[PDB]
């Protein structure tokens, strides 16, 4: 019970070994106040960093942000915002920490933000991130980008669809498969002939060569 | 025999046969041992031509990186199941640093009594 005690005689009698060995019998009774300061007189950073990002004390734990700035206490910080509303630090934290489709949702579910998922996954070109730039391409439509992102997600009818109509459809072929050989000109264009834009597909049909 | 660590993926403790009576798996694994299986038949009454009901088709096999442990106490399944533990994976707290460091009023059987394949004697020397 002599946590005042026991801790000046764990100034003391020590230069390192003590401290974190009475910081530790510290937690042993539960004084933060003594174990967590004579941690970083201990070097002990680390468990400082893990009670400080633990505690909803994430500003107590930015100093020590400054020795681990890693996904364990940012993108926790971040996913604390996200409870509490900031979800710009979320999604921020996600694309520190690689949740790249969870940043593209919140570009298009929460943070609004069409032209940064637009541009983050035609350089990112990923699936699920794509896939919520597929919903919001069946929101909006970009360009290319949006045929792109229509077609690494899965959503196939609707860049499909667009290439049936719109000139949209030699990229939609090419992020298809490949939208360069006279076989798949053919076939594409076979279902232009079957589903309108019949000029450029006899245009490719002539891009065939025959 | 494999202590998984939840950060640094699988690390291995130790290969206990199961061979335990014709025994090729292992169905379980209880404090003292592990109960693997065994052949399934009914045994004769000693005796006689009749035949009693079989005890259990599940062979406890010993476990053997856990010496001193079954005979002993449960503050030894504790401690050096801790021990082990800091084995596979690599550890100091459980056995030593999280029974030393807590204010914990007792005079154990086993604080920790195996732990000297991490090299440490003493936990065995002023407990036992």
């Given at each position: 019970g002599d946590l005042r005690q026991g801790r000046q005689l764990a100034m003391?009698?020590?230069?390192?070994?003590?401290?974190?060995e009475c910081a530790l019998i510290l937690e042993?009774?539960?004084?933060?106040?003594?174990?967590?300061?004579?941690?970083?007189?201990?070097?002990?950073?680390?468990?400082?960093?893990?009670?400080?990002?633990?505690?909803?004390?994430?500003?107590?734990?930015?100093?020590?942000?400054?020795?681990?700035?890693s996904s364990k206490l940012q993108l926790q910080f971040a996913k604390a915002k996200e409870a509490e509303g900031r979800w710009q630090e979320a999604a921020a934290a996600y694309e520190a920490a690689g949740?790249?489709?969870?940043?593209?949702?919140?570009?298009?579910?929460?943070?609004?933000?069409?032209?940064?998922?637009?541009?983050?996954?035609?350089?990112?070109q990923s699936v699920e991130a794509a896939n919520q730039l597929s919903r919001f391409c069946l929101q909006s439509q970009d360009f290319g980008g949006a045929v792109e992102f229509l077609l690494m997600a899965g959503q196939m009818d609707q860049a499909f669809d667009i290439a049936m109509g719109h000139n949209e459809m030699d990229t939609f072929a090419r992020i298809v498969a490949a939208s360069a050989k006279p076989v798949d000109y053919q076939r594409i264009a076979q279902y232009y002939e079957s589903r309108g834009e019949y000029d450029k597909a006899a245009d490719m049909w002539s891009k065939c060569d025959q | 025999i494999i202590f998984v660590d939840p950060d640094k993926g699988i690390l291995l403790q130790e290969y206990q046969p199961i061979h335990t009576g014709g025994a090729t798996a292992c169905i379980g694994s209880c404090?003292?041992?592990?109960?693997?299986?065994?052949?399934?038949?009914?045994?004769?009454?000693?005796?006689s031509g009749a035949f009693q009901p079989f005890t259990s088709n599940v062979s406890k096999a010993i476990m053997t990186s856990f010496q001193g442990m079954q005979d002993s106490d449960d503050k030894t399944r504790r401690a050096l199941l801790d021990f082990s533990f800091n084995?596979?994976?690599?550890?100091?707290?459980?056995?030593?640093?999280?029974?030393?460091?807590?204010?914990?009023?007792?005079?154990?059987e086993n604080m920790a009594h195996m732990c000297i394949r991490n090299k440490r004697l003493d936990v065995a020397e002023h407990c036992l």
């Open positions: 003391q009698l020590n230069s390192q070994t003590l401290f974190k042993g009774l539960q004084q933060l106040t003594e174990a967590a300061e004579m941690y970083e007189r201990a070097g002990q950073f680390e468990r400082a960093a893990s009670i400080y990002i633990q505690t909803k004390n994430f500003a107590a734990a930015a100093p020590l942000m400054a020795r681990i700035s949740d790249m489709d969870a940043v593209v949702r919140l570009c298009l579910e929460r943070l609004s933000q069409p032209q940064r998922a637009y541009a983050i996954v035609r350089k990112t | 404090a003292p041992h592990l109960l693997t299986n065994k052949k399934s038949m009914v045994q004769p009454a000693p005796g084995l596979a994976t690599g550890n100091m707290d459980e056995a030593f640093r999280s029974v030393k460091a807590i204010k914990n009023p007792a005079v154990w």
